[PDB]
Short mmCIF file of C-alpha atoms and ligand atoms in Angstrom, two decimals:
data_model
loop_
_atom_site.label_atom_id
_atom_site.label_comp_id
_atom_site.label_asym_id
_atom_site.label_seq_id
_atom_site.Cartn_x
_atom_site.Cartn_y
_atom_site.Cartn_z
CA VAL S 1371 -40.64 135.71 -147.52
CA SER S 1372 -37.45 136.80 -149.51
CA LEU S 1373 -35.01 139.26 -147.76
CA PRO S 1374 -34.47 142.48 -149.92
CA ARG S 1375 -31.71 143.72 -151.59
CA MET S 1376 -29.05 144.74 -148.69
CA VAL S 1377 -25.56 146.38 -149.02
CA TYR S 1378 -23.15 145.32 -146.26
CA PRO S 1379 -19.68 144.05 -146.00
CA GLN S 1380 -18.74 140.58 -147.48
CA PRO S 1381 -18.26 137.92 -145.08
CA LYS S 1382 -14.40 136.94 -145.24
CA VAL S 1383 -14.18 133.02 -145.33
CA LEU S 1384 -10.41 133.00 -144.58
CA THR S 1385 -10.82 135.68 -141.41
CA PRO S 1386 -12.12 134.25 -138.05
CA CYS S 1387 -14.98 136.78 -136.80
CA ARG S 1388 -13.28 136.51 -133.22
CA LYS S 1389 -9.73 135.22 -132.67
CA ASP S 1390 -9.94 135.16 -128.87
CA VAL S 1391 -13.18 133.24 -128.32
CA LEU S 1392 -15.05 130.31 -129.07
CA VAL S 1393 -17.86 131.53 -131.30
CA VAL S 1394 -19.41 128.01 -132.19
CA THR S 1395 -20.22 125.04 -129.50
CA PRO S 1396 -19.16 121.40 -130.54
CA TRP S 1397 -22.85 120.73 -131.31
CA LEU S 1398 -22.78 123.55 -133.71
CA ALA S 1399 -24.72 126.31 -131.62
CA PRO S 1400 -23.52 129.69 -132.15
CA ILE S 1401 -22.09 131.30 -128.99
CA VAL S 1402 -23.20 135.01 -129.19
CA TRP S 1403 -20.43 137.51 -128.96
CA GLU S 1404 -19.98 140.97 -130.70
CA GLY S 1405 -18.57 140.51 -134.01
CA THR S 1406 -20.50 137.42 -134.77
CA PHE S 1407 -23.36 138.78 -136.21
CA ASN S 1408 -24.78 141.47 -138.62
CA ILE S 1409 -27.81 142.78 -136.76
CA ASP S 1410 -29.02 144.23 -140.18
CA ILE S 1411 -29.67 140.88 -141.62
CA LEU S 1412 -30.90 139.41 -138.54
CA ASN S 1413 -33.45 142.43 -137.80
CA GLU S 1414 -34.67 141.55 -141.41
CA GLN S 1415 -35.17 138.03 -140.81
CA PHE S 1416 -37.14 138.49 -137.83
CA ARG S 1417 -39.31 141.39 -138.65
CA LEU S 1418 -40.37 139.74 -141.73
CA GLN S 1419 -41.71 136.96 -139.36
CA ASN S 1420 -43.34 139.56 -137.19
CA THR S 1421 -41.82 138.34 -134.31
CA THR S 1422 -43.12 139.10 -130.99
CA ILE S 1423 -40.74 138.54 -127.78
CA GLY S 1424 -42.08 138.00 -124.06
CA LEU S 1425 -39.81 139.30 -121.37
CA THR S 1426 -40.34 137.75 -118.09
CA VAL S 1427 -39.48 139.11 -114.77
CA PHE S 1428 -40.01 138.45 -110.94
CA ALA S 1429 -40.51 141.33 -108.75
CA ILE S 1430 -41.41 139.78 -105.45
CA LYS S 1431 -41.62 141.64 -102.10
CA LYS S 1432 -38.41 144.12 -101.93
CA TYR S 1433 -37.33 143.53 -105.40
CA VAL S 1434 -40.11 145.66 -106.94
CA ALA S 1435 -37.82 148.48 -106.21
CA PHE S 1436 -35.60 147.21 -109.35
CA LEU S 1437 -38.32 147.55 -111.84
CA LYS S 1438 -38.35 151.23 -112.69
CA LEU S 1439 -34.48 151.10 -114.24
CA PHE S 1440 -35.11 147.42 -115.36
CA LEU S 1441 -38.01 148.66 -117.79
CA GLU S 1442 -36.68 151.94 -118.64
CA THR S 1443 -33.55 150.26 -119.53
CA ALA S 1444 -35.39 147.47 -121.54
CA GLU S 1445 -37.00 150.29 -123.53
CA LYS S 1446 -33.51 151.46 -124.71
CA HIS S 1447 -32.10 148.38 -125.29
CA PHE S 1448 -34.25 144.98 -125.57
CA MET S 1449 -35.60 144.10 -129.01
CA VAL S 1450 -36.08 147.75 -129.87
CA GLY S 1451 -38.26 147.76 -133.19
CA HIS S 1452 -39.71 144.69 -132.57
CA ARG S 1453 -43.00 143.47 -130.68
CA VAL S 1454 -42.23 143.14 -127.04
CA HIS S 1455 -44.53 141.96 -124.26
CA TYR S 1456 -43.24 142.26 -120.56
CA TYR S 1457 -44.62 139.91 -117.93
CA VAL S 1458 -44.23 141.32 -114.48
CA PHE S 1459 -44.75 138.51 -111.80
CA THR S 1460 -45.48 140.31 -108.64
CA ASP S 1461 -47.17 139.99 -105.14
CA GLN S 1462 -47.81 144.01 -105.41
CA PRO S 1463 -49.68 145.20 -108.44
CA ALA S 1464 -49.77 148.59 -107.13
CA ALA S 1465 -46.05 148.74 -106.77
CA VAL S 1466 -45.19 148.47 -110.45
CA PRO S 1467 -44.14 151.28 -111.86
CA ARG S 1468 -45.70 153.32 -114.54
CA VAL S 1469 -42.96 153.19 -117.32
CA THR S 1470 -43.74 154.74 -120.68
CA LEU S 1471 -43.43 152.13 -123.44
CA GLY S 1472 -42.29 152.65 -127.08
CA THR S 1473 -45.03 151.46 -129.90
CA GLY S 1474 -45.76 148.06 -130.39
CA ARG S 1475 -44.62 147.08 -126.67
CA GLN S 1476 -46.91 146.15 -123.81
CA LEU S 1477 -46.76 145.41 -120.22
CA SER S 1478 -48.85 142.73 -118.30
CA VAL S 1479 -48.76 142.18 -114.42
CA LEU S 1480 -49.46 138.95 -113.29
CA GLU S 1481 -50.26 138.45 -109.35
CA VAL S 1482 -48.40 135.65 -107.71
CA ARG S 1483 -47.83 134.43 -104.32
CA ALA S 1484 -44.70 135.26 -102.40
CA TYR S 1485 -42.67 132.45 -100.61
CA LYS S 1486 -41.03 133.50 -97.45
CA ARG S 1487 -37.39 132.07 -98.32
CA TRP S 1488 -35.63 133.80 -101.12
CA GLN S 1489 -34.56 130.49 -102.42
CA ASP S 1490 -38.20 129.47 -102.57
CA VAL S 1491 -38.92 132.49 -104.66
CA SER S 1492 -36.21 131.99 -107.15
CA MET S 1493 -37.00 128.39 -107.55
CA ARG S 1494 -40.72 128.75 -107.98
CA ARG S 1495 -40.33 131.24 -110.85
CA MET S 1496 -39.94 127.62 -112.96
CA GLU S 1497 -43.34 126.40 -111.95
CA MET S 1498 -44.70 130.01 -112.59
CA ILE S 1499 -43.06 130.57 -115.88
CA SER S 1500 -44.50 127.12 -117.11
CA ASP S 1501 -47.89 127.72 -115.83
CA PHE S 1502 -48.15 130.70 -117.97
CA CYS S 1503 -46.56 129.20 -120.97
CA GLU S 1504 -50.29 127.78 -121.02
CA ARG S 1505 -52.40 130.58 -119.79
CA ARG S 1506 -50.79 133.52 -121.89
CA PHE S 1507 -47.58 133.15 -123.50
CA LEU S 1508 -48.52 130.26 -126.28
CA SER S 1509 -51.26 132.60 -127.74
CA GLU S 1510 -49.30 135.93 -127.25
CA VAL S 1511 -45.48 135.69 -128.12
CA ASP S 1512 -43.05 133.72 -130.16
CA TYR S 1513 -40.01 133.44 -127.88
CA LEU S 1514 -39.62 134.00 -124.11
CA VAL S 1515 -36.69 135.37 -122.40
CA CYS S 1516 -36.51 134.76 -118.75
CA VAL S 1517 -34.09 137.15 -116.54
CA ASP S 1518 -33.65 138.39 -113.21
CA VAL S 1519 -34.89 141.92 -112.32
CA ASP S 1520 -32.06 143.45 -110.17
CA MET S 1521 -30.30 144.09 -113.44
CA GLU S 1522 -30.15 146.84 -116.23
CA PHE S 1523 -29.60 147.05 -119.70
CA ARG S 1524 -26.55 148.89 -120.84
CA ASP S 1525 -26.39 147.97 -124.46
CA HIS S 1526 -27.95 146.20 -127.39
CA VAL S 1527 -29.85 142.87 -126.45
CA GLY S 1528 -31.72 141.91 -129.88
CA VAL S 1529 -32.99 139.13 -131.97
CA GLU S 1530 -29.48 137.76 -132.30
CA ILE S 1531 -30.46 136.00 -129.08
CA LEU S 1532 -33.50 134.40 -130.59
CA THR S 1533 -33.63 130.38 -131.36
CA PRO S 1534 -35.59 127.58 -130.03
CA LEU S 1535 -33.51 127.10 -126.50
CA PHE S 1536 -30.76 129.35 -125.05
CA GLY S 1537 -28.50 129.67 -122.25
CA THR S 1538 -26.22 132.06 -121.14
CA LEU S 1539 -22.44 131.91 -119.85
CA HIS S 1540 -22.45 132.56 -116.24
CA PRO S 1541 -19.79 135.68 -115.84
CA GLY S 1542 -18.11 134.11 -112.77
CA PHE S 1543 -17.10 130.68 -114.43
CA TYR S 1544 -16.70 131.40 -118.21
CA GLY S 1545 -12.95 130.75 -118.30
CA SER S 1546 -13.11 127.96 -115.48
CA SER S 1547 -12.48 124.13 -116.13
CA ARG S 1548 -15.54 122.09 -115.42
CA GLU S 1549 -14.41 120.53 -112.42
CA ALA S 1550 -14.58 124.04 -110.66
CA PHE S 1551 -18.30 124.25 -112.02
CA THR S 1552 -20.60 124.84 -108.99
CA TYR S 1553 -22.75 122.17 -110.40
CA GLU S 1554 -24.71 120.06 -107.72
CA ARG S 1555 -22.39 117.29 -106.92
CA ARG S 1556 -24.44 115.17 -104.83
CA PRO S 1557 -25.74 112.03 -106.46
CA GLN S 1558 -29.11 112.13 -104.02
CA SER S 1559 -30.15 115.25 -106.07
CA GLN S 1560 -31.92 115.33 -109.52
CA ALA S 1561 -29.35 118.14 -110.50
CA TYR S 1562 -26.44 115.99 -109.85
CA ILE S 1563 -23.67 116.33 -112.61
CA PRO S 1564 -20.30 114.30 -112.20
CA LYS S 1565 -16.85 115.85 -112.23
CA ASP S 1566 -16.10 114.58 -115.78
CA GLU S 1567 -19.52 115.90 -117.46
CA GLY S 1568 -20.48 119.63 -118.23
CA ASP S 1569 -20.05 122.20 -121.36
CA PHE S 1570 -20.61 125.21 -119.84
CA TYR S 1571 -22.01 126.95 -116.52
CA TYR S 1572 -25.09 128.57 -117.35
CA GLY S 1573 -26.43 131.30 -115.34
CA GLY S 1574 -29.98 131.11 -113.95
CA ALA S 1575 -30.61 134.70 -114.24
CA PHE S 1576 -30.96 134.73 -118.38
CA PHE S 1577 -32.40 131.97 -120.46
CA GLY S 1578 -35.29 131.53 -123.25
CA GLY S 1579 -36.13 130.25 -126.30
CA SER S 1580 -39.31 129.47 -128.11
CA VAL S 1581 -42.46 129.29 -125.83
CA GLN S 1582 -42.52 125.33 -126.55
CA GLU S 1583 -38.90 124.88 -125.54
CA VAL S 1584 -39.17 127.15 -122.62
CA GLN S 1585 -42.22 125.35 -121.16
CA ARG S 1586 -40.25 122.00 -121.46
CA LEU S 1587 -37.45 123.47 -119.74
CA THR S 1588 -39.21 125.20 -117.09
CA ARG S 1589 -41.54 122.42 -116.19
CA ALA S 1590 -38.45 119.76 -116.50
CA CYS S 1591 -36.91 121.89 -113.69
CA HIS S 1592 -39.80 122.57 -111.51
CA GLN S 1593 -40.36 118.59 -111.76
CA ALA S 1594 -37.13 117.80 -110.86
CA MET S 1595 -37.21 120.34 -107.79
CA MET S 1596 -40.38 118.77 -106.59
CA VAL S 1597 -38.61 115.16 -106.74
CA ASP S 1598 -35.51 116.92 -104.47
CA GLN S 1599 -37.88 118.27 -101.99
CA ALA S 1600 -39.73 115.10 -101.52
CA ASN S 1601 -36.33 113.57 -100.94
CA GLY S 1602 -35.42 116.32 -98.64
CA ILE S 1603 -32.46 117.86 -100.55
CA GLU S 1604 -32.22 121.26 -102.26
CA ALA S 1605 -29.83 122.04 -104.83
CA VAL S 1606 -26.72 123.90 -104.00
CA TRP S 1607 -27.83 126.89 -106.44
CA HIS S 1608 -31.35 126.04 -106.65
CA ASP S 1609 -33.14 126.74 -109.92
CA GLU S 1610 -29.71 127.36 -111.55
CA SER S 1611 -28.39 123.92 -110.65
CA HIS S 1612 -31.61 122.31 -112.36
CA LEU S 1613 -31.16 124.66 -115.25
CA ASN S 1614 -27.73 123.38 -115.72
CA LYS S 1615 -28.68 119.69 -115.60
CA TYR S 1616 -31.37 120.34 -118.11
CA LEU S 1617 -29.08 122.19 -120.68
CA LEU S 1618 -26.30 119.47 -120.27
CA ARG S 1619 -28.83 116.50 -121.49
CA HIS S 1620 -31.00 119.10 -123.75
CA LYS S 1621 -28.26 121.01 -125.74
CA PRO S 1622 -29.08 124.98 -126.39
CA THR S 1623 -29.41 125.71 -130.00
CA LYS S 1624 -27.49 129.23 -129.03
CA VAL S 1625 -25.36 130.00 -126.24
CA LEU S 1626 -25.34 133.85 -125.17
CA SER S 1627 -21.78 135.14 -124.24
CA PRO S 1628 -21.04 136.94 -120.85
CA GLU S 1629 -21.80 140.27 -122.49
CA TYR S 1630 -25.36 139.24 -121.74
CA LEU S 1631 -25.06 138.41 -118.33
CA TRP S 1632 -22.35 140.74 -116.24
CA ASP S 1633 -21.33 142.27 -113.15
CA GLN S 1634 -19.03 145.08 -113.34
CA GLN S 1635 -18.41 145.78 -109.65
CA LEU S 1636 -17.33 142.11 -109.15
CA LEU S 1637 -15.41 141.09 -112.36
CA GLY S 1638 -14.65 144.60 -113.93
CA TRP S 1639 -14.64 145.23 -117.77
CA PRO S 1640 -12.05 142.45 -119.42
CA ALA S 1641 -10.76 142.97 -122.97
CA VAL S 1642 -12.90 139.96 -124.17
CA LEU S 1643 -16.10 141.76 -123.83
CA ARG S 1644 -16.47 144.41 -126.36
CA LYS S 1645 -19.98 145.26 -124.70
CA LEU S 1646 -21.71 144.84 -121.52
CA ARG S 1647 -25.13 144.30 -122.27
CA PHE S 1648 -27.11 143.21 -119.34
CA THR S 1649 -25.38 144.13 -116.15
CA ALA S 1650 -26.07 143.64 -112.06
CA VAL S 1651 -27.39 146.58 -110.21
CA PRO S 1652 -24.54 147.16 -107.46
C1 BHE A 2578 -15.03 131.51 -109.17
C2 BHE A 2578 -14.40 132.74 -109.77
C3 BHE A 2578 -14.62 133.38 -108.24
C4 BHE A 2578 -15.63 134.55 -108.75
C5 BHE A 2578 -17.21 133.97 -108.84
C6 BHE A 2578 -18.05 135.11 -109.10
C7 BHE A 2578 -19.29 134.53 -109.63
C8 BHE A 2578 -20.20 134.38 -108.19
O1 BHE A 2578 -21.61 134.47 -108.72
C9 BHE A 2578 -22.48 133.81 -107.92
O2 BHE A 2578 -22.41 132.14 -108.75
C10 BHE A 2578 -23.36 131.34 -108.05
C11 BHE A 2578 -23.00 130.04 -108.36
O3 BHE A 2578 -21.59 129.68 -108.13
C12 BHE A 2578 -24.48 131.50 -108.23
O4 BHE A 2578 -25.02 131.92 -109.72
C13 BHE A 2578 -24.89 133.24 -107.67
O5 BHE A 2578 -26.36 133.45 -108.06
C14 BHE A 2578 -23.88 134.17 -108.10
O6 BHE A 2578 -24.03 135.36 -107.64
C15 BHE A 2578 -24.90 136.49 -108.46
O7 BHE A 2578 -24.30 136.68 -109.84
C16 BHE A 2578 -22.92 137.53 -109.50
C17 BHE A 2578 -21.97 137.97 -110.77
C18 BHE A 2578 -23.37 138.75 -108.52
O8 BHE A 2578 -23.84 139.79 -109.55
C19 BHE A 2578 -24.02 138.26 -107.42
O9 BHE A 2578 -24.57 139.68 -106.63
C20 BHE A 2578 -25.39 137.53 -107.72
O10 BHE A 2578 -25.96 137.05 -106.58
C1 48O A 2579 -30.55 138.24 -105.05
C2 48O A 2579 -31.64 137.13 -105.47
N1 48O A 2579 -31.94 136.41 -104.40
N2 48O A 2579 -32.79 135.70 -104.30
N3 48O A 2579 -33.46 134.82 -104.38
C3 48O A 2579 -32.05 136.94 -106.87
O1 48O A 2579 -31.14 137.63 -107.65
N4 48O A 2579 -32.75 135.91 -107.11
C4 48O A 2579 -33.37 135.85 -108.40
C5 48O A 2579 -34.79 136.48 -108.74
O2 48O A 2579 -35.46 135.98 -107.94
C6 48O A 2579 -36.31 137.23 -108.03
N5 48O A 2579 -36.61 137.62 -106.41
C7 48O A 2579 -36.00 136.85 -105.49
C8 48O A 2579 -36.29 137.26 -104.05
C9 48O A 2579 -37.06 138.02 -103.82
O3 48O A 2579 -37.45 138.29 -102.51
N6 48O A 2579 -37.96 138.66 -104.62
C10 48O A 2579 -37.68 138.54 -106.01
O4 48O A 2579 -38.36 138.87 -107.06
C11 48O A 2579 -35.79 138.35 -108.48
O5 48O A 2579 -36.36 138.78 -110.03
C12 48O A 2579 -34.41 138.02 -108.55
O6 48O A 2579 -33.58 138.90 -109.59
MN1 MN A 2580 -29.79 138.64 -107.69
#
């Protein structure tokens, strides 16, 4: 489907869009920072495809408290103008707040079991996302975005992120050398990455892609975690460690800057971040 006539500033071939950051990976995946995209062009492209975006979030045990702000702020900032399906995984159906949604947006509550250890609650998201990539997501959405719940949206998070497979630069380590990355370093774990390998340290709190690619990632991470469990080892940063192994070996087709995953209490507001889009609740 052809784009309509649009009036916007001409791209400047001989002017970099950012002079302070890397905006494309060495495998030619865009790194998404403010100033790299014209959202009007992208909105047109994705609306003409009638794109539906699923957003998964786990609110298990006491984390149900985070849902109200998460959903209210998602309504202000997440894929506004596009079709959205929220999927709230919880052990407490009745504790999901009644948040008023804009048109073309819906929410499903998916009841799941609560594991005792926070590590297992975090890790079993991979299994649960993979399982539902079959039950619901393949028929209901085009893309999945999988995030932590103890967060709020403060600025635009839109179709600029959508791509077959994306990860997000962890806010603690975007300026770190690979040897300093907290990858799993024990060869006995499936998540093992040697000191001389690694592109980026991706945050477990924000990843996504097409349903097919998210199914692949989440199943791979789950199956890897089950191998580790059988061998009596648990990766240093749990699902995040396995996510990082997967994305090393299967390069993402976009990488999101730390604008998309931030903690202002711990890290402030650096000049390199023109926007703080999705942030930790302090
Ligand atoms: C090196 C510079 C020294 C400073 C390093 C600052 C980042 C530390 O970050 C932790 O990183 C871990 C991996 O190594 C896990 O991803 C953990 O979930 C994360 O904590 C999370 O994200 C943080 C941003 C906070 O929101 C914290 O409350 C979260 O639990
Ligand atoms: C602080 C934390 N710790 N744990 N695990 C965490 O953020 N875990 C990742 C996500 O796992 C989910 N979670 C974790 C523990 C829990 O009791 N309930 C829950 O929903 C939330 O969606 C969290 O955002
Ligand atoms: Mn957390």
